[PDB]
Every structure is written in structure tokens, then in C-alpha cells.
Write a protein that binds this ligand. Sequence first.
Ligand SMILES: N[C@@H](CO)[C@@H](O)[C@H](O)[C@H](O)COP(=O)(O)O
Ligand SMILES: N[C@@H](CO)[C@@H](O)[C@H](O)[C@H](O)COP(=O)(O)O
Ligand SMILES: N[C@@H](CO)[C@@H](O)[C@H](O)[C@H](O)COP(=O)(O)O
Ligand SMILES: N[C@@H](CO)[C@@H](O)[C@H](O)[C@H](O)COP(=O)(O)O
Ligand SMILES: N[C@@H](CO)[C@@H](O)[C@H](O)[C@H](O)COP(=O)(O)O
Ligand SMILES: N[C@@H](CO)[C@@H](O)[C@H](O)[C@H](O)COP(=O)(O)O
Lengths: 266, 266, 266, 266, 266, 266
Amino acid sequence: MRLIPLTTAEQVGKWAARHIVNRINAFKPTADRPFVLGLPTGGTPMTTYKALVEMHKAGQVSFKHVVTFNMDEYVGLPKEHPESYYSFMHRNFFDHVDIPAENINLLNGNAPDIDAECRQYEEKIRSYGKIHLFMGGVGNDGHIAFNEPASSLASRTRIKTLTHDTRVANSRFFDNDVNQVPKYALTVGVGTLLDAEEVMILVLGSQKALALQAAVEGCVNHMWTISCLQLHPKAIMVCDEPSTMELKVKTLRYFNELEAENIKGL
Amino acid sequence: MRLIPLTTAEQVGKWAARHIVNRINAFKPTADRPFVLGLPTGGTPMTTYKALVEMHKAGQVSFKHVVTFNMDEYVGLPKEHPESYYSFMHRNFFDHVDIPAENINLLNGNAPDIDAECRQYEEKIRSYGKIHLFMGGVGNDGHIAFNEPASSLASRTRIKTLTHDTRVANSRFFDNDVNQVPKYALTVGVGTLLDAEEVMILVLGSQKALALQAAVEGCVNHMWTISCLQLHPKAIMVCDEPSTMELKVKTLRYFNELEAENIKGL
Amino acid sequence: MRLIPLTTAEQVGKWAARHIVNRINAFKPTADRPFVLGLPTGGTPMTTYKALVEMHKAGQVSFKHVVTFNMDEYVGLPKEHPESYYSFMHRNFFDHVDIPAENINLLNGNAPDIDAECRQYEEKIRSYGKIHLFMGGVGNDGHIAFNEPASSLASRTRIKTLTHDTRVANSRFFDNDVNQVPKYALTVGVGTLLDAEEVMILVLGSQKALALQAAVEGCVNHMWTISCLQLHPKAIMVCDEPSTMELKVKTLRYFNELEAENIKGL
Amino acid sequence: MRLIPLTTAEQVGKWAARHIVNRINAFKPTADRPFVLGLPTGGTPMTTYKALVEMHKAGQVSFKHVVTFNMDEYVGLPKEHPESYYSFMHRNFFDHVDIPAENINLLNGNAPDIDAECRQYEEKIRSYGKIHLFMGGVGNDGHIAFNEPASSLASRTRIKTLTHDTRVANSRFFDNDVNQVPKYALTVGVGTLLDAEEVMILVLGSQKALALQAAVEGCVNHMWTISCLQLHPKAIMVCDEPSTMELKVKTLRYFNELEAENIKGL
Amino acid sequence: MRLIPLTTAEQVGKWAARHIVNRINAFKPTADRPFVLGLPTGGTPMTTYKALVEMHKAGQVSFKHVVTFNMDEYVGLPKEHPESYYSFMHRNFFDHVDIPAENINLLNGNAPDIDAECRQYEEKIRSYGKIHLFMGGVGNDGHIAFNEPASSLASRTRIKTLTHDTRVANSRFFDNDVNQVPKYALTVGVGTLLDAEEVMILVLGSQKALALQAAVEGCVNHMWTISCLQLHPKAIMVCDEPSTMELKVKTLRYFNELEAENIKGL
Amino acid sequence: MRLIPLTTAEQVGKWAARHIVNRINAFKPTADRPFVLGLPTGGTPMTTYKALVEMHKAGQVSFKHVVTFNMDEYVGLPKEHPESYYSFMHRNFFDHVDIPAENINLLNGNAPDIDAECRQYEEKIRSYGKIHLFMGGVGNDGHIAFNEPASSLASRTRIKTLTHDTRVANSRFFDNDVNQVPKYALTVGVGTLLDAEEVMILVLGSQKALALQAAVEGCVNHMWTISCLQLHPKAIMVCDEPSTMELKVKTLRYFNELEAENIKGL
Ligand SMILES: N[C@@H](CO)[C@@H](O)[C@H](O)[C@H](O)COP(=O)(O)O
Ligand SMILES: N[C@@H](CO)[C@@H](O)[C@H](O)[C@H](O)COP(=O)(O)O
Ligand SMILES: N[C@@H](CO)[C@@H](O)[C@H](O)[C@H](O)COP(=O)(O)O
Ligand SMILES: N[C@@H](CO)[C@@H](O)[C@H](O)[C@H](O)COP(=O)(O)O
Ligand SMILES: N[C@@H](CO)[C@@H](O)[C@H](O)[C@H](O)COP(=O)(O)O
Ligand SMILES: N[C@@H](CO)[C@@H](O)[C@H](O)[C@H](O)COP(=O)(O)O
């Protein structure tokens, strides 16, 4: 596993954004072979989305042939509601890049048949073959996507009931009223994520310190689904300073020297 | 993973039995496509077997096209010995249902060539393709089937030497004399179980509290093979009240509300 | 998992060597179907290599049709340097057996293109199909091959940066000067090892007690890659007396009686 | 140890206030034998102070013969700053009850001689003999008073350097600017609290869930100073619902049966 | 801490009895300076009482000048009920030795004033000065006396509410009906036991394996009150084979070398 | 607890020596009130003794009025053997400073009456009142003095049987032959060290990394006797870089900010 010990969130977004750009450009997407990108929502990727937009405007990357798939979406929340993941994605990303509407894949949290929705989503990923790079975040309780503690490490896209603690964390976007945040959400499973060619998790803040420790130093278990990365052949964790506070000295020492050159880019 | 927090063993058997019935009926087994069912022995499934028999007598299910495979069988114990798993199954189940003798698959604990026996068993499962629902229990030390601590999480059907503690637990059926219980037994491996489409573990009693905690809150490891369910995409654990005593408040809180409707059937 | 509790290193080598011999002879290798053997370097296998050489000289085994693959090799160290794994293997083994030069596969730690080297190595294993028996050791920090803590449990052959602690341990062969030991090394991944038909780990000494405990009693995690054996269907650990000091009484009791006959050969 | 499991902060405040009132009234304090109350500051005790004031105005208690000692104070914060513990204690309690000015004891965070201030504080406690009841809170990191992780369990009143997490936690009262929160504070040591006849800690909110678990279910250690209560012959922990989430079901169950009557004021 | 590793309960009884006899005889008690023996009830001490009686009848000890104090008694159980600790102590020991009626001390579980009964009990111990040897057992949950999980490590004689597991465990003596086992009991606290000159705990059976491990290898904590012995300058634990199963090989090894001579009475 | 995080053993020696010198000079010892220094042997204190001698020769301290008490001594080792602690203390310290022969206190490992030797040793400490500063080291297994795992935390000076790991560790000084290392030794108990006004432990090398972690981050337990310092009101641990590797980043961070000024002698 690769862990990139950075200091600031701004640095994390810059690093993470440059990485996505390098992968796309190295891949050389065409209409027949698009680059499939997995994407998250929340506060963590904000700097990354900003960096990417900056790079696109500078003519450094084009998304004309990039296909995207988002990790999840709230159930029952209106599409046009400012806090739906659909709104989030467009406001913060799509509205500023040249990605065509065909290439955008979001889970329909208002599908008449929830079960058909999840099944079709998996089918969509399969049709393109494989997600090349899946970017995401980690929850306070260690959940990846919305695979809350006790989710199967082999799970597929399905409807999931959120842990009260997650709703409380997410209530920031709902005027701090827990009663506002949806009790359920459609999410890609751990198995889905594991099928991706490369997984890149952004970790920012002290609230994620126990989660990061669980992912790096812990054992594989379904209570902290983020630990599934230990079984992934190409996992990367980009973190800032405060999120590494629960790690051992030797753990952070090892990674710091591995990435020494890799992060001096500034 | 789904955990059904129930109060009484009677409730567990009722829930578990109704689930098996719903799956079979929803499947609609025919002579060409039978429903393959995995089954355990011991004290835990007693209420389930009783419920099933009740439902069959009421004309709610028929086993005329259900194929069964049992988890294990003692080595060296005579078939007709009242405590052989062969005797157990017929006395407690088969003797009361309309399952034809062809559809019954039990491990021969007295096979001249133990190695050929296990290999043929695996072959038998393969010929039908896949076990649809595998029901089982959990040992005090967390063993699933007779996969004692240190059994490979990728293991196949083989001969296994029982842990002294297991023999002591099983001595209840041998007039409480440990010297009576067989030292070895043929058992399906963790890999075998994992190949099943759905796994349903019944957990009853305080003796299983540490085991249940290990399965739900613990990490995957071969010392408590029951933890292999964390890697299974369709695992269900039906428990009574005393078995949930080692869980965290939040863990039992989460599941109780998930199953709230699902268990109100009474 | 099988654990062979032995007393002395001499006993370990004897047991381990006899096992390799039995497997080869039972396999009956020919030019078209060779027996593929995985091999380690270090101090642990010394008695095993000696035993094997003794057995070959006695006409008990021939390596004329055995193909070998070594776990790793230092990067940047000259081939002819007495402490390169290439030198180690020939001095301690190849120089005394009848294995033809074609059948010897070692990682080129001085390849102009490191990435091509690792890829070709994997290809080499694939061409023969599958490694039949992979013998190895365990590091103080639990690393198998040079898959240091935090290596992916699904990893493939690649270049790896060694943990300072490993270099310190390996400095014994470099006149006790840490500055002498290479900072990097080419190594087969955990995924590579897992693809082998049977894995046999030799464990000798008190320095490996925490590692052995992690492998046998611990949970699967990438910090102690040796724990990957829990997911392997055919893993064997041969140990001496001092390495079992961190195990539980019951754990060593169980294995001692399982192998009672199996080790009385003396 | 007693743990009063209530649901809301309002209840915790009523139980706390009620318990203090009963101790005082049962004590029948006089000028020659006053009751000695140790007190905390922070968000936790807010409901308890409100209830105490109420009961006082209602003629249920008189602090005419009660001497108070506060746990801590910030170093270098002006005594008139609305956020100094001195201000907190007057604004929220002293300004509303009938306690003599000479009966109030507070650590002076602006003392020219810090060691002298602290020593004289312990000596002022000694002159009275002992603190009959010491009320307190618990920090996110499990700190009792400002005895941060790694504080001696036999510590006395001395100055302490506040952990970054505590400063961030306390920034709440300094308009969310950590830079405004004092870096140091004078606090009573663990040994000083252990010398009280009875200790009562108030735990509210999910943020203290880990602290509560460490206190109740953990072992004695100086990283979570709240663990010192396990050594106290008379410790009570009053908690709301969210703070008990990290506890085992059995643990909560026990305390629920235990305090059934004692918590039904209604 | 000394741990006497024996094989059988019979041996444990002989070592225990022998050790008590040697202390008394070495003490040379007189009416003006009696020996003070603290004693337990339950299945564990049965072999020790048998051996004590024997040695007495054989003229090896005289309890003429020995004062006894028992650890606990059930609240609300008739003194004449065959299962009251009073009955147990007479049936199994007092009725067979030469100890004066005035030298026997037992807690009255039917005392109208429970706090008074308990206080006077501590005062009766104080009048004699100190308990020279306090013999005891250990509960499945690690309880010493009836100091259930979460009992203060500095606790005194007081009433305690018995854990459901203890009641279920003790149902053995109430014809397996938990409803017949008293819900409360008067017991000496942890601090009271810590005040004895020497403490000797008897551990028998695999059911105590976890309690023994917590005692010997765990940390000091109030959930497993037997951990208080780590704080005692003179504690001995006499155990049989099954009770040591959860211990590390090294731990058992150490004690075996340590007590070699001391356990070879033969 | 204070932890001085330095980089090298040379620095640790300078900080240690400097701290001892300041205590003595600040104490202003006289013949009627001498300073009492407790001292250790082994490789760890080598740099501290060198620096003490230096400072002495430089006229910075006088041991004319300093009484010394050493922690331990080997049983059955000739007082003139170059490896006896007596020899160590003279060769490395006494032979170079101005301390009176009557001010030196050492345990006699060849005492005909071991209990008497040990008792009189505690009595000699009592006559002086108390040890003002007790300097020590830590064993790989976390032992303070020779209080091996499972030693009472309230232990006094007595004889102890050395753990095999300690003997192997100490073989360094007996030309690597464990058979030459004494099996027993007289040592001050945990309670004796806890009675010192201040304790200062020296930790050097990666081999002590686990001992340091147990001491700083672990819980109080008798398997790692160094954990007793958590109970000491005045304990300091001086460490080099390698010994801190098992600590959490946050833990090291805290101590670094804490000791910044205090470690910059330069
Ligand atoms: N909503 C999910 C991502 O789409 C989830 O994994 C999320 O990243 C996690 O809850 C962290 O959220 P944050 O970025 O707002 O901290
Ligand atoms: N015998 C096995 C099931 O066939 C085993 O898994 C069994 O379920 C387990 O030992 C639990 O037994 P119990 O149901 O008697 O408690
Ligand atoms: N060098 C590797 C084997 O090729 C590594 O796994 C090695 O076995 C391990 O470091 C143990 O070394 P040792 O045998 O020298 O103890
Ligand atoms: N500041 C101390 C109380 O005086 C401390 O114990 C406090 O209770 C703790 O930091 C928690 O603060 P809170 O009450 O604001 O949660
Ligand atoms: N009842 C107490 C002894 O008087 C308790 O310590 C007892 O030893 C423990 O409950 C174990 O009971 P057992 O001796 O019946 O196993
Ligand atoms: N022998 C004792 C010191 O007198 C012991 O505390 C010692 O410090 C410990 O065994 C470590 O030895 P070392 O100093 O040689 O590392």
C-alpha cells in the first residue's frame, strides 16, 4: 500500500489531482476506450476538485473521453436538492469541465425499483469493463463509500442504511439537523471498489485519525471497511498532517522516506 | 452481514425456518433444478427443524425436490449409533419430511478411503452446481462446521481432528463422558461454505457470546473460523438474547433498528 | 494450517528436507513436467539445504528435473558479491546438487529495467504453470519474502524498499554495518506466494516468536504479511522450541498431539 | 463503581444536583465543620448548575456553610476574561447562591510563583481535612481535570501543558480560534482527586463514548486518567444515552438493573 | 506472584492444605495471638477442606487458636438452608475440626441493618489486627469474593448485586434453577483482601482459564477483580492443568522451572 | 511522567548526569543529611557514568556526602569476578569519584542468609529515610531492576529467578555463553523503587522499543514491571531515537513540544 504523508489539505488535493491527470494522460483515452474514473462526495475531495478544475482550465487535461461513476447517492432526496450528490458533483466539478453528459453515471436515489437501479449500475461498470482509478474518502467509523460497519467485504452495489454517527457527521450540510439527513443511500459495495484497478483514498483531519490507523495498522475486518485496501494490489492513501496522529512513529517514518522525493514537488 | 436480534430460541427457529421456506418456494424447485440446502447437527438447530416439520405438515413446503448436504460426520462412529450425525438427521428431520433418499447427502465417516470420501463429496456439490442456502451453527471456540481454530480459511472438505474443548462440549450427547466422543470428523471446509450462495448461522446461548462477538466485531482470522462470514456477500446470523451480551451497545442498536419490521412478525 | 513443533534447528532442516524429497519423488518429475520449487535465502534454511545435499549425495533425490524460483534478490549488489542471494544459493545449494543451469531462476537485481525484470519473472512462473512447493522463512517483523509491513496481500513481484529493522537484522552478513546492506530488493509478492500449491515456512529462534504468534494466533493484516497463510489452503510451519514461546498453551498442545506420530521419526 | 445511565443531559443535571443536595443536607454542615465541594467547568456541568441554583432559590439547600475548590484554571488568562474559569464559576453559580466569598477557592492562573500557588492550594485543602465530594467531567482523551495523557496517577496540583486536542476542543469558547485557547493550566492532580471521599463524573454526548469505555471497561493506565476511578472506593459516573454507545451490552444491562429504582424520580 | 502449576484438583487441595498447615504451625498461635484464616465457599475449595480435616484427624494441626473470617454470604437466605455459606462452612469444615465456636466469623445475610453488619465485620477484623492468610477462589468473570466486574479495587465489606452469570453458575447448588439463587450477597471488598498478609487463590477447571489469564497476564482493571493480586506483595495461585490453557507457553514454562522442587511432594 | 526524547546515547548520558548533578547541588548534602542515589548496572548507564566522572574531575560535583544503593546483584557470583555488579560499580564509577567507602551500599549475592541480607538492605534504606533519586534501566521484557514478569507491584528486596531471555540478553558479558550467566539475583522490589522521591529510567536502542511503549502507552500490569512508573508522582524516562519507534506519533509529538527548551543544552 502506498501512503503519501502530506501536511495540508491543499497539498493533498494538488497531489491527488496531479495523479489523476497523469493517469488519464498516460492512458490516452479515445471514444472507443475511455478512462473510467470513480468519484466521491463530501468535504474531503474539495481541494482535489478545485485543483483538477484549475488544471483543466490551464489545458492540462480534458475529460471529453473520461467516464465517471460516483460511489453513492442519498435515497429519497430530490435530485435538484442542493445537497444531493447529483447537485454536489455538478456544482463542484462537472459544471466546470468538458465532460459530456453521456459519460456521467450517478446512482438514481429515486428509482422506482431500487433493486433494478443497483443491478444496472453494476452492469454499466461491466460494459466499460473496469474502473481504472477509484477516488474516495473514509468515514469517521472507517466506512468506504457508505459501506457502514458490518458490511460484507465482498458486497456489491445496494441500498444501505446509514449509521446514526454518519448522519450526525453529514448533518453539517443539512443545517446541523440530524433529522434532515437521509436514513438510507445507494452505494457501491466493497467488492465493487475492489474490482477497480487503482484505489486512491484522501484522508484529511483529526476526525479520521482512528480510521487511518485502522486502515494502515489494523487487521482486515468488516467493522472498518476501509481495511479492505489491505487486500487491494494498487491502493494509495493521501493524507494531511493531523490524520497521522494515531500511527506509530516507525509507520510514518517508513512512508516519509519512501515518498521523500515523490512529495518534494511541493 | 445481516444479524437478526431475537429473544428466544423458539423465535430463532421460527424465523430461520420461515426463511428457508420462503427461499425454497421463491426458487420453485423441479426435478431438473433442485434447491440445494446445507444443514448442521447439534442442539442449536432443534427449534428450526421442529418449525420446518410443522410447516411441512401444514402443507407449507415440500422437500420432494430439495437436495441436502450436511456439514460433517464423526469418524469411526457406527451409522446406526444414535448419536451419529446420520441418526441425528433422520430422527430429527428426514423421518418427518417428504425428501427422497436420493436427495440426501451425508459424509461417510466409515469410508475405507477417507480421502476419496471427501473428494467425492466436493464432486457431489459441484455436480448440482452450487449450494443455495447453507445453515449452520457456531462452536464455543468459533468453529464453523468442524473447522477448528487454525483451519485454513480456504479449506475444502477433509478429515479434521477435534479440539478437546469441542469434545467436552459434545460429550453432553455421550452421557457426559469425553472418552466417548470421536477424536476426528469429516467436515466441509471454510472454502466449501464460502462457495454457498447464502449462509445462515443460528446462535443461541451465553456460551456463544464470545464467538458471536468474534464473528461480528472481530477481525478475519483462522482461530475463529466463524469470522470468514465477513468475506461472504450473503451471510445472516440469527441470534437469541443471551448470545449478544459481548457486543457493543451501538452494534446491537444498529441491527435492532434494521430488523425492527423484519422481526415484528412475532 | 499445519504447524510442526520441533525442538532443534537440525530437526527442522531434517523434517523440512525430507518433506521436499517426498513431494518431488511422489511427483515423479520428467523433462516435460518438472517439479517447480520456491526457495529462500538467509540463516533459517541452512540446516534444510544441508539435509537436502546429504540426501542427494545418498542418491535419495535428483534435481535433474526440478525448476527453482527464489523469493528475492538485493538491488544494486553485484552478482559475484559473496552476499548476493545468487552467491548464497550456489555456495549453499546449487554447487552440490545436479540441477541444470536452465532450471535455475533468480531475480536479476541489476536489470537495466527493474519493471521488466519483475514482469518477466511472473511470466516465467506462469509458463511452467504453478509452483508446487514454496519454502521460505519469516522476518522479525513478520515479512514473508521481502514484503515488508504494509505490503499488499495481493501484491505481485516488484521492487521493495526494506525496513530499517530488516537491514539491521541482515547486517550480520555485512560485517554488522547497516550502511552495507542494500536499501532495496526485488521480491515475489504475497499474491505470488499465495498462488503456490503448498507453502512451507521454517521458523527458528526467539527473534521469530512474535512473528510466529502473529501467523498462528493473529488476524490477517498487511503489517505482518506472514498472516497471509491463513488464507492459504496448504500452509505448513516447521518450528523449533524457542519460536513457540509466545503461543498459548492450548495452541501448542493441539499441534503437538496432531503431529505426535509425524515427528517421532526423529 | 456506580454508573447512573440516564437518557438526557437535563436528567444528568437533575440527578447530579439532587445527589449533591442530599450529601450536604445529610452532612448538616456548620461553620466549624463545613461541607467541601470540588467543582469543574466546561459545557458538561451546565445542567447541574442550573438545577442547583433552582433548588437553592426553592429553599432546598444553603451554601452558607459549603467551601468550594475548583479543579483547574488557565495560566495567563486575565481573571476578568469572560472565559476564565473564575468568570465561569461566578457567572454560572456563585452569583446566584448564598455562599460566602471566603468559602470560595480558585487556583490563580496568573500567580507569579506557580509552584507556590499550587502548593498553597493543596495546603488549603489539607486545612479543611478533606473534600467530601468532588464533581467533575471527562475529556475526549479521557482526562480528569487537566491531567492529560501520561500524567502520574499519584500526581498533585501542578501546572500542565494542554494537549492540542483539548485546546481544539475548548476553542468552542474562544470563537473557534485554537490560537486564543491558553496553552497551559493549573490543575489538581490524580492523587488529589483520589483523596476525595466521593467522586462523581458527568459524561454527556457521543464524543465521550471512548472515554467512558476506557473508564468503565479499560484497564488502569495514565493515558486515560479517568481510569483512576477504578482505584477509588466511591466513584459515580452519571451518563446520558449517547455516551454509553461504546459499552458492552452486558455492562449497560448490569447497571440498568442496578440503578432501576434509584433513577426513577419521574 | 507465585503460581503453583499442578495437574489435578486433588493435588491443588493437598498443596493448599499443606501450605495452610505450615503457616499455622510456623506461626505457633496462642489465645493472645491467634492465627487469622480467611475462607471461601463453592466447589473449588472442596479438596482443600477434605485434606485439612484429614491432617487434623491425623494430629498435624489444631484450630483451637485459629480465628476464621469468611469472604461472603447470600442476602436473604435462611441460615439453615443447606446452601447458605454458613451451612457450607459447617457441613464441610467446622463440624470436623477443633475450632471454638467463638473463633468463627461469618457475615449475616439476614441482618436488619446491612451497612451496620458490614461495618462491624470490618471492625471485627481490625480488632484482631490482620488476616494472616486469606484463601479464595475466582469466578468465571474473574471475580474475587463477590466483587463483581466494575467493583472498586479499594472496596470494603458491603452488599453487592450478583451478576446474572454468577447466579447461573451457582444454580448448580439450587437444582439448576437460577430463580432460586439469591440476587444479592454481603462480601469483603477488594481493599479488605489486599489488607491480608498473604492471599492464596485456588483455580480449577477450564472454565476459569480466562480468569486465570486475566489475573496473570492481564492488566490491573476492575472488570476482572482477580487482577488486584498484581498489587499484592504476597499472592499465590494454585492451579490444575485445564485452568492454564489460556496462558502463554513462556509464562507456564517460567512457573514450572520456578516451582519444580516445591511441587514434588510425591 | 516526563519523557526526554533525545537522539543518541551520548546525549542521554549527558542529560542524565546533568540532572543528577543538579539534584545533588540543589540538595546541598551534608554528613548529617546526605543525598541518597540509587544506581543500576548494565550497558545502558555507561554514558551517564562517563559524564558523571567527567563533571566530577571538572569540579562540578562531590560525592563526599552522597550515599549509594544499587538495585541488584547476582547470586553466587564471586565478588571479584569482573562481571559482578560490585566489580561493575567500582570499575565504572566508584574508583573515579570522591565517595567514602562507608557511603556505598551493595547487595551481597553470596550472603549465607538470603532473606536476612535482603531485609537488612531495606532497613539500611530506612535508616537514611529515603532515596532522593533512583536511576535505572529497563529490560527487554519491561523489567525494572530484576523484577521479572509476574513480580508483585508492591514487592520488596528479595531474591528472584532470572527469565531465560534476561540471561540470554546478559550473556553479552559472559562471552556469549548463557550457561555462565547466574540464574538468580537479589533485587529491590517494585514497592522499594516506588518509595524513591524521583525515578529516572534510561532507555537506549530499538531492543527496548516494546518496553518503552508498554511503560508509556500500556496499562499498569506486573508482566511489564516498568509500568509501575505510571503510579509514581515523579518519573522521568530519558530515551534515544530508536527506542521511541513503537510510540504513537501524537505521543512523541506531545513530549517533543514539552521538552523543547529543556533538551537544548547544545
Ligand atoms: N459519501 C461517501 C463518498 O461518496 C463517503 O465515503 C464519504 O467520503 C465519507 O463519509 C467521508 O466524508 P467527508 O469527505 O465529508 O469527510
Ligand atoms: N457439528 C457442527 C454442525 O454440523 C458444528 O458447527 C456445531 O454446529 C457446533 O459445534 C455448535 O453445536 P451446538 O449446535 O450443539 O451448539
Ligand atoms: N530474504 C527472504 C527469504 O529469501 C526473507 O523472507 C528471509 O527469509 C527473512 O528475512 C528471514 O531471514 P533469516 O532466515 O536470515 O532469519
Ligand atoms: N476543564 C475540566 C473541568 O473543570 C475538564 O475535566 C472538563 O470537564 C473536560 O475537559 C470536558 O470539558 P466539557 O465539560 O466541556 O466536555
Ligand atoms: N463465592 C466466593 C467464594 O466464597 C467466590 O470467590 C467463588 O470462589 C467463585 O464464585 C467460584 O466459585 P467456585 O469455587 O464454585 O468455582
Ligand atoms: N540489571 C538491572 C540494572 O541494574 C536492569 O534494570 C538493567 O537495566 C536491564 O536488564 C537492562 O540492561 P541493559 O542496561 O544492559 O540494557
